[PDB]
From a paper:
Phosphoketolase (XPK) belongs to the transketolase family, a member of thiamine pyrophosphate (TPP)-dependent enzyme superfamily. It converts F6P, xylulose-5-phosphate (Xu5P) or sedoheptulose-7-phosphate (S7P), which are intermediates in RuBP regeneration, to produce acetyl phosphate (AcP) and C3, C4 or C5 sugar phosphates. XPK is an enzyme present in many microorganisms, primarily involved in substrate-level phosphorylation to produce AcP.
On the other hand, Bifidobacterium longum XPK showed no inhibition by ATP. Comparison between the C-terminal interfaces of free SeXPK and free B. longum XPK structures provides a structural basis for the lack of ATP inhibition in B. longum XPK.
Author numbering:
A (entry chain B), B (entry chain A): 2 to 807
């Protein structure tokens, strides 16, 4: 449960004191000085004479175009938090403005507790300057290593979705989301603007989107800054926002006047926020107009105006680093020296190098600090879910009528399980889906909650199961759901989100970024506590896209996911749900897990059920297991072939092929691989099953016929080192598909039961079984011709049921 | 060069005749009848008695929620084209409305020329009805098999970028881009709205975005339809559009009145289009307000109102298929029969089943038809580029001073080459880049063209190289560039686009879709002529992300790309530019190629040059080649190890390791793999090099040490079948990185020269070379400590130059 901190939504009811604004100005100066020292300095932080080119870093790496504006905003936000005691977490959308965040963490004090070696004196200042973007130091971007960070910012376009996710079910949290004007050009952010139609002011917090309209991208102006101001205000007001505009730094106005003006504007916007919050207590049915700030400043606002006769301040030339070589020429070093002295550090630092007390006297303290805020470190907030007992949802007909019984839809069991999880954990668990929950048969959750929808309502005939507050969020944008869920987990909550398989690639970048957030966390960041796992239910897979066809059949998500399994981080888990019971075991494991990305591939089509819950759990605790009941060989030596499968449709095809093989006297073994990553090399992955266990499951001499869900490429690239890998004959998706009957789909990919039977015969004796192979190959064509002639699959294919059903 | 067709931008200067609107109404009726027959009917197309449940398809597959609105729009657009003779290509954003497009193709006649077996009579009508979404038929979506299609519509959010790309450098082309309201929620489309700031009305065509605001997604209402109309108009006017609104079908108004009203509204919008075009001839500096149409209609507009007491028309329940089982119950069959008879097909079809002449008397003819428009079939327009002679750009210092000379930046040579290509081919070649052309060192193109930018201008100090018309387009959105380039190629033009490596994943979906467009084209669509290849210059790769760090280091693009190499389609090419000359050869091959996706991975960092242009061409014509000069073994038998590399940084590390090995007397071979797909299995890929050639390059017994750019997983999954695959020891990216010196980057991934030397020693004799291995492993740590202490890489690492430089 998200905690309430301080006194949320209080109006100041007084003008901002002059001492507070003096503190803000001194903070801005000292923060800019630290941001410059990090990029350029390495030694002699206080410029004690002699200050020479020796003290400049050899390789100048970093960004400065956005840093001073971020320092300005952060200083004013710090004054605001100190005055009001608001629960605040800052989303820094331009993550390349890393020095701003690191400077804030150093100034508020949190960086010293987090890293004790960086003291608050001259030596600590020297280390702090040196370590930025340094070999063995800290990253340039606003990184997980930085206290008070929940958004990396490497990628662009996910600041707004992250802010809105952070405020969901968090009524007392205020999130100022700083957005780069160039970042606003990205596709994800343009639809993230429209995310105020899915949050309720009473049940959720408040997001204040601060558009950092500095004018330029890297070597390019931004579209937003160059269109007319009337167009900008009209555009923002068309998306349910009330635009306020602040303009500074474009003339010779004194800095203290700028601080006064921003104080007044900020207090006005805060008054509208408090009015919205107070209104939401009584009326929360009709959507308000959330204010948003348009912050127009020159890029690299405080840097020297001209360098080599080139306009630097207020241009794109200041994005990465002005003074690209301040160590190679004397004129550049003099420019840098004057730039550093312009902030007058002699009055900002005491004799010992500590920032003077009166500079930070206005700073917030305790839990209120951005660095120490719990919503930044979502691990400490996180509490484990209350999970319903699993046997309540087990499919018991398997244990009575035998394996392979029925035509159940696999995902409905997960739907019921998640419904009861929501029932036990309201306001703490949430389901996302890009318009596809009902298609993924997860609608069982609607019995205990509603779809959160804050746009207009028209009629009851079409608005079933929607409400202003709910635990289900839908919007046709995978970026929205991914960002929402990542932010939701990063703040300490839990959730799951489901999608079509081919469309998960839309968020291939996003997943990667989260993986990078986890890999960085597990390796070198002990103080960042574990967060809940990100659960992605991939459904409506390639093998059953009847209505859509070729455009919707892309199983390549696994190929992307495997790229992130290195160095025993275990941040990735890929699970294949053979049936409903296997799905239950997988989901239970995933919901108990932490610091992982769990992709559960389950089909929504009517499929048989093979395992009991105990059997499924036993298979899952190893990752792959031999089905003793399905096999005909009592020992490894007897088997003439091993049929291994991963995925529901491949499992069905393998079992159907096994039935035909059993009529021919073939001794074969049957293996099901629930978890893909268990097949990884033992010495590479300690959690992966050992080579001895692998050899026990797959005998060395016996050929192995593997039927796989995704492309065979990723499996073959995974088992290269394993014993008997050369005998594996993997059959996977082969980029063949259309709108056609289910038998045709598996036929054109050579994964059907008849082709699998012919393959298993060929690994034994093509010469002995030549006639049978000819008959099977003829029958494939005859069955396809039957589907063409009569419009549906063959009675042989459709009516087939396993011989073990009682 | 894009041709001029008909009489572009003519005002009608007369009211629409009543006979034309009668024709439009009859067209709408017959098109809806055909769309229903495709989804439901299997036989007896004209409902000749007896009409029973036998004639209904067993498996009802398709979409109807968007079909009638598309039929309405297409009928009115057809009347418009017939009246004005405009050059028009329709982008159908809701691609799931396939029956609309197929019905249009059948009605205008083009489908009969394209597929002669589908005659225009009762038997042809029966075949046309049966083949939709059928085994051995045609896909459900608006597919490449459908004449007059350039956008699949499978994925959502790329209609606007495709339209804007289609109109670039096409002054006479008018593109009505139909956009689904649910599709407008997607991230790519929200930023595609802002694409009118990058097109010039004089030099480009006109896009008319038709927002198909039918209200609902699948089982969910849309955000756009539920916000207030004032908000909608304000939002669209804030993005430089003039919104016109049409509302129909929500009451009992007669259909003919709806047709009259839409005729008047369409003519008004066309008058504003013609005014904009006429103005652009004299003044094209200031941006106009392009009109856009908001088309509010009930979803599944003409279907029965209620089915099972559930609101079907005007709801989300009609998205895929109303009457989900019209074959299983008599009441459902009666509902379907009445639905079919409501269109009165008895007067729309003659005795022989041909659509009556007076129904299509208003139709356009010849090249003007949407099916027969050349801009739909971009292959016939396409003409080969005028390529400058290659030796003009060869780096000649290699042939004089020896291999490995210099510190040139690889991509600058490509910059000069593309500059001269633009010079020879203006208005036909175009460069795209998500704000990264100057970072990718492609700015040499600015000497002959400008960045196209139609937003406001402020000053010359910051607006260098921008102009209202240019051959370079920049906007911080990879979706924009990918869609622009795909549409540009699909209409017959050529282009290239460059990007950071980690961010190509942002368009992982888009690439896949284009691959699907190509694979479908090469296999079964002969009448679709080849289009220009899509060239993606991947630069600023993982090994040299000094400023950004861990967030920007993701080489997984190759893993996605390999998933699309099946069945000898050869739609994918991955090339690794070792140096400038190799890059020139690669680019020449790519620019001459057709129907491919070519990913050229070249580094922007200062790197040595190894090959002459003839040598690079010789290596490229095989894909992998043995460097005879670098090797020490004259024959395959002598070598104790083979050092193979793919990529510039891996090549540098391999050569540096070879220099250290040569001092120890080791006989080794050196191999460079320019093209990855040449390593694919010979029997799988006919273009891939044979197993005999592979064995010649890599001897069977000798161990092979492979240094790879991307993850080792994809390489190992590619060479499973090849001889001596078990001896390969691939070293690739291992998810280790930060902001640090270049030596550290390759050190933490165990791909540096010292680790490679130790590895190559270990494949020979760990026991003999134990002391040398210990010394190398100590030296790695000492060199990293030097970088930590002094801030830059070791003099041993930095100052090293190949021993073959004269
Ligand atoms: C999708 C994407 N494309 C490109 C980049 C490379 N990049 C890093 S920072 C940056 C510029 C950011 O522009 P803007 O939003 O204007 O930021 P600011 O001016 O505040 O630095 C770019 C393009 C990226 N991070 N993400
Ligand atoms: C990114 C993405 N997510 C999901 C889908 C699945 N899908 C196919 S059609 C469709 C509904 C389209 O909605 P809308 O734009 O309102 O279309 P219309 O009402 O005209 O059918 C969806 C969600 C998709 N094609 N692309
Ligand atoms: Mg900016
Ligand atoms: Mg719609």
């Amino acid at each position: 449960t998200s905690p309430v901190i301080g006194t949320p939504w209080k109006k100041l009811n007084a003008p901002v004191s002059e001492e507070a604004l003096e503190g803000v100005d001194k903070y801005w100066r000292v923060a800019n000085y630290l941001s410059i020292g990090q990029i350029y300095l390495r030694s002699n932080p206080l410029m004690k004479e002699p200050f020479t080119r020796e003290d400049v870093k050899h390789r100048l790496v970093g960004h400065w175009g956005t840093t001073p504006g971020l320092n300005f905003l952060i200083g004013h936000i710090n004054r605001f938090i100190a005055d009001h005691g608001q629960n605040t977490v800052i989303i820094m959308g331009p993550g390349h403005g890393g020095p701003a965040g690191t400077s804030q963490s150093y100034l508020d004090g949190t960086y010293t507790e987090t890293f004790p070696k960086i003291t608050k004196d001259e030596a600590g200042l020297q280390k702090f300057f040196r370590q930025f973007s340094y070999p063995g130091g800290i990253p340039s971007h606003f990184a997980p290593e930085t206290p008070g960070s929940i958004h990396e910012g490497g990628e662009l376009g996910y600041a707004l979705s992250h802010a809105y996710g952070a405020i969901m079910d968090n009524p007392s949290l205020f999130v100022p989301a700083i957005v780069g004007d160039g970042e606003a050009e990205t596709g994800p952010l343009a639809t993230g603007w429209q995310s105020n139609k899915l949050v309720n002011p009473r049940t959720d917090g408040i997001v204040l989107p601060i558009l950092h309209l500095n004018g330029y991208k890297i070597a390019n102006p931004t579209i937003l800054s160059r269109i007319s101001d009337e167009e900008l205000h009209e555009f923002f007001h068309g998306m349910g926002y009330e635009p306020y505009e602040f303009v500074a730094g474009f003339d010779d106005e004194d800095h203290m006047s700028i601080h006064r003006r921003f104080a007044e504007l900020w207090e006005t916007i805060w008054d509208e926020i408090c009015d919205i919050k107070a209104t939401a207590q009584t009326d929360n049915v009709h959507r308000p107009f959330y204010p948003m700030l348009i912050f127009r400043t020159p890029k690299g606002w405080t840097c020297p105006k001209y360098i080599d006769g080139k306009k630097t301040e207020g241009s794109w030339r200041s994005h990465q680093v002005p003074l690209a070589s301040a160590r190679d020429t004397e004129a550049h070093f003099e420019v840098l020296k004057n730039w550093l002295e312009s902030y007058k550090p002699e009055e900002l630092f005491d004799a010992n190098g500590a920032v003077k007390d009166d500079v930070l006297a206005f700073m917030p303290k305790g839990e209120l600090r951005i660095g120490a805020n719990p919503n930044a470190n979502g691990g400490v907030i996180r509490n484990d879910l209350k999970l319903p007992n699993l046997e309540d949802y087990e499919v018991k007909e398997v244990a009575e009528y035998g394996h392979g019984w029925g035509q159940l839809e696999a995902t409905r069991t997960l739907g019921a399980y998640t419904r009861d999880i929501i029932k036990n954990n309201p306001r703490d668990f949430r389901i996302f889906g890009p318009d596809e929950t009902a298609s993924n048969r997860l609608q069982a959750s609607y019995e205990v909650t509603n779809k959160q929808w804050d746009a207009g309502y028209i009629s009851d005939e079409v608005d079933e199961h929607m409400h202003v507050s709910g635990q289900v969020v839908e919007q046709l944008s995978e970026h929205q759901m991914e960002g929402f869920l990542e932010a939701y987990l990063l703040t300490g909550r839990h959730g799951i989100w489901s999608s079509y398989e081919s469309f998960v690639h839309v968020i291939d970048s996003m997943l990667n970024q989260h993986a990078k957030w986890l890999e960085a966390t597990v390796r070198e960041i002990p103080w960042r506590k574990p967060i809940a796992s990100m659960n992605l239910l991939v459904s409506s897979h390639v093998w059953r896209q009847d209505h859509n066809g070729f455009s919707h059949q892309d199983p390549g998500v696994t190929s992307v996911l495997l790229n992130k399994c290195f160095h025993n981080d275990h941040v990735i888990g890929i699970y294949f749900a053979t049936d409903a019971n296997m799905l239950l075991a997988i989901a239970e494991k995933c919901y108990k897990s932490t610091n992982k990305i769990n992709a559960i591939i389950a089909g929504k089509q009517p499929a048989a059920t093979w395992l009991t819950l105990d059997e499924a759990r036993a298979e899952l605790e190893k990752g792959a297991a031999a089905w003793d009941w399905a096999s005909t060989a009592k020992n490894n030596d007897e088997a003439e072939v091993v049929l291994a499968a991963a995925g529901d449709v491949p499992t069905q095809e393998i079992m159907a092929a096994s039935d035909k093989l059993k009529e021919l006297g073939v001794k074969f073994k049957v293996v099901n691989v629930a978890d893909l990553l268990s097949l990884q090399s033992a010495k590479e992955n300690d959690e992966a099953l050992t080579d001895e266990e692998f050899a026990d499951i797959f005998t060395a001499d016996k050929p192995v016929l593997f039927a796989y869900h995704s492309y065979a490429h990723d499996v073959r690239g995974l088992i290269y080192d394993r014993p008997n890998h050369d005998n594996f004959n993997v059959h996977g998706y082969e980029e063949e598909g259309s709108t056609t009957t289910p038998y045709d789909m598996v036929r054109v990919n050579r994964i059907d039961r008849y082709e699998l039977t012919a393959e298993a015969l060929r690994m034994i004796d093509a010469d002995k079984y030549a006639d049978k192979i000819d008959e099977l190959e003829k029958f494939r064509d005859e069955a396809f011709q039957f589907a063409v002639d009569n419009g549906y699959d063959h009675p042989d294919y459709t009516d087939w049921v396993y011989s073990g059903v009682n």
